[PDB]
From a paper:
Otu2 binds to several sites on the intersubunit surface of the 40S that are not occupied by any other 40S-binding factors. This binding mode explains the discrimination against 80S ribosomes via the largely helical N-terminal domain of Otu2 as well as the specificity for mono-ubiquitinated eS7 on 40S.
Classification revealed three main sets of Otu2-bound 40S particles, representing eS7-monoubiqitinated 43S pre-initiation (Otu2-Ub-43S-PIC) and (partial) 48S initiation complexes (Otu2-Ub-48S-IC) as well as unmodified pre-40S particles (Otu2-pre-40S). The pre-40S particle resembles a late-stage cytoplasmic assembly intermediate prior to cleavage of 20S rRNA at the 3′-end by endoribonuclease Nob1. In the pre-40S complex, only the N-terminal domain of Otu2 is visible, whereas the OTU domain is delocalized and also eS7-mono-Ub is not present. While overall levels of eS7 mono-ubiquitination were slightly elevated in whole cell lysates with the catalytically dead Otu2, we did not observe any ubiquitinated eS7 in the assembly intermediates after the affinity purification.
Author numbering:
A (entry chain R): 2 to 126
B (entry chain W): 2 to 130
C (entry chain A): 2 to 207
D (entry chain X): 2 to 97
E (entry chain C): 34 to 250
F (entry chain V): 1 to 87
Write the structure that this text describes.
Amino acid sequence: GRVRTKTVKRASKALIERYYPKLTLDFQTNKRLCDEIATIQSKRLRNKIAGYTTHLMKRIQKGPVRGISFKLQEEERERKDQYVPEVSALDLSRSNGVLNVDNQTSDLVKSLGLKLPLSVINVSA
Amino acid sequence: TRSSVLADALNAINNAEKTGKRQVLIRPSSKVIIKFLQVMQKHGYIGEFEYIDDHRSGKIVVQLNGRLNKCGVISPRFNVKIGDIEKWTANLLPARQFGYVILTTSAGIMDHEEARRKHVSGKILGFVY
Amino acid sequence: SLPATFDLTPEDAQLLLAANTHLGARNVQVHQEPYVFNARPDGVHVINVGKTWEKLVLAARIIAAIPNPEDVVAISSRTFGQRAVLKFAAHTGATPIAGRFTPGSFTNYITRSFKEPRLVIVTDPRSDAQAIKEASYVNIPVIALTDLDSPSEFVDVAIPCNNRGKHSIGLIWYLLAREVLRLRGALVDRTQPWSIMPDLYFYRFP
Amino acid sequence: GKGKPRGLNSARKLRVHRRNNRWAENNYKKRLLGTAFKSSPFGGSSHAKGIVLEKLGIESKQPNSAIRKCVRVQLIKNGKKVTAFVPNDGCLNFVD
Amino acid sequence: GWVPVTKLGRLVKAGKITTIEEIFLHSLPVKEFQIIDTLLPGLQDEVMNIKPVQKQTRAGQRTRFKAVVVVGDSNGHVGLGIKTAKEVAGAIRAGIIIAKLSVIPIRRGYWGTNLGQPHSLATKTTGKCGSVTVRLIPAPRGSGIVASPAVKKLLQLAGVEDVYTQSNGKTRTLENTLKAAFVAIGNTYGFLTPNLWAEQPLPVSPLDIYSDEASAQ
Amino acid sequence: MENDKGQLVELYVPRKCSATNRIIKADDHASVQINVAKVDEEGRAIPGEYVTYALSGYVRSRGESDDSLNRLAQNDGLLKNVWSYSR
RNA sequence: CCGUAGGUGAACCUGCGGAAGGAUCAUUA
RNA sequence: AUCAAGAACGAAAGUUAGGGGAUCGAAGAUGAUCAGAUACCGUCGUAGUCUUAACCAUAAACUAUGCCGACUAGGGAUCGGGUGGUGUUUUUUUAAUGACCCACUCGGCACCUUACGAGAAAUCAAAGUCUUUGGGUUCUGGGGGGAGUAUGGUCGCAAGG
Ligand SMILES: [Mg+2]
Ligand SMILES: [Mg+2]
Ligand SMILES: [Mg+2]
Ligand SMILES: [Mg+2]
Ligand SMILES: [Mg+2]
């Protein structure tokens, strides 16, 4: 089997996690791209790395891969806070201002000493 | 059957201290258990203890703090001489600074130091340290 | 040893009963019997929420008692818990552990996941039990969020809540965050509600 | 209660138990049966004088082949015959 | 040179911890050996046993050397360490590190009267490891260490001089005997004596008061 | 202990556990030092001074460290109606 | 293997009753 | 409460004297076979197996764990009894019960987690409360064979204990 070496794999992983956008589906541009950005000592190894970056540009255009890309990581930096609801489920208007509370928790409310808009609901089994 | 009542009392105290609680339920009572826990109390090895009446024979609550690493009973109540006090004081105590042997003497129940300085002896019950 | 303003404000009690924190599991351990008040007769117990408020008041005092705010570490592996602890670590400056907590992180200084805390918060002590037992080796207090059938060993100041629902865990992390920022001094007025809503901590799966 | 009668009036069962349980020692059984006087060919004595009888060339294989240069000896005081080792001689030219 | 990695290392490398009483009082685990190296100049290692052990792995027979190393002050500090290595010097080296990590203090007390320096153990402690119980009794002054030479050598490497020992079980394995005697001599702090009833205000931890030095960068 | 002359001859007098009054010894690596900062009247914590607890590993390995620590906080005036003196 | 009985046998087999000191997979409520 | 002496019971097989003797079936009578994967296989089958009267007193008679008493963990169950329910069902018209459910409660057969504690470990709510060694009591063991042999006694018709 022609399993590629780990140096070519790791160099392609670094150059695609950091230098994504100028690499494309054409190997011939990627050859002098990795010439102009990377100092690789031999023509054979830089051909290996440029062909592997071409192949990872081939399958990256169909979907996301487990490795790091920037243009997704801004997006899960506003995924943390962009979907704040104006009214949550914990607000009063989703139950018309009066809570759906059984008799025992209303006994907790009247025993602890607080005033609260509760509707007693009778539940069994 | 239940042979000694002091033995089950002190075994219950030792078990409830080795599991680390702060209160026991000693059952039943005697003169001997009451006076034994008074001997522990005068040295401050236990805190409050409390006696509940029930008209049969009373249950005792002892609120033990932490201070008793082991008390115990010597169940064949051997007759001890004045000169035999050093043998039990060397065999069951940790060292020569603390640690007590409780005797029943004809002047009453007292520890081994009080039996030394009373200059009496009697029969051995147990040991509190 | 606390002022009288610190207690249950009724909007927080409405907020607590809105998130269904008072509902719990079916087994009641010997240790956590005082947290239950009584049982709704299907098999679901209801918990004293004043105990949850004052217990998280203790946990807030533990977190505020540390001198270095980066030395407290939040632990999570539940799906709601990663979002909850990253919001808490964003808002108080704690060090979060999201996803798989690395074994050998509390001993074994070689690993780059070695952090030694002085204080550890855990989402539940059953699924994140390995951080509990590795913190049991290097003398660390752990304040935790325990259910009514959680393992109660090796925890101290444990907050009864519901770890099953996303409402209760996101809210209870939010309330711990707002309690410690109201206790540190970032929000001066005790009367003023905190500007961030609790639904920021809430998990959504798209 | 660990299986012994710890009563203050219980010396007799302990003492009969210790008397009957001391027959499991081999040394006690040798001393209070007179084993050293009836089957011991020395008669329980540290030495015994003898008159030699033969030359025993016993071969004794494993693990060490001992070329046994030893003498059958008839004792004097009792008239029974024991074997006897001769030490330190390579030749046994002395005990004829 | 040496770099610390934890807060306990950088406090003593900055010289803020005086001795190892402040480690033992707050029960911080000693995690690197340089803490005990810097805090204790007077530690004398002494090698106990060298045992060649034949080792088999994947039809490969090689010989490893099991080493028993005890370290100790002439004060009350005892370290014991068990490590097997391929070579002799590496085995005794890993012995003095592993004994240097686990150092446990000893409560030295008085037999009977109260004259002079402490000379013996305070109370009788036992210890079990394997099938071996070793019981250490307090002794009068100048009585020597009445012991097997292994546990005797452990006890003049301990700061005591006067102990009677009593043992049981198969004590012909010196690893389990020295382990049980180490547990027994470490068990002395842990007997609640009547002259320590006195309640004390609890000291604040050194990590709390000295929080802004020894911090991670 | 103490000698005759009036000078303490000890290495260290150990930390007693605040639950069961037992000795936290040196290798007790499950032991916990609990720090609670008391509060100012306007809801702030003075970062220098504290109330203080110590729990032995014996109590913590069981799991009544919560219940014993609730008792400690309530009898130190910090809590009310959480731990109950009866059951 | 044990207990009992029998034919024998250079060993050993067989009748009746016990024990595991012998190795619970899958499936379902 | 525990137990020398003494006594009752004691699986299977065995023993005497009867009844029965379907099936199974040690002994025996018979066939084989053909190979060193190998005689287990077959068919009659007596004793027996079944019962009555009397013996016999051994087993891996095992939970391989003396008996009584106290303490040290819970919970899912279950068996027998009891308590309570503006609980259910069974209707006739509401009950009564009967059955089912819940919360208990004693008293049994068992389970699962631990470890505080034990042990050499496997493992153990006892195999814990034991070098910090004592609740009461009965029996047994002291390296392995020789050997449950020799001999003496004792019971039994004998086999045998
Ligand atoms: Mg021996
Ligand atoms: Mg066997
Ligand atoms: Mg008999
Ligand atoms: Mg038998
Ligand atoms: Mg023999």
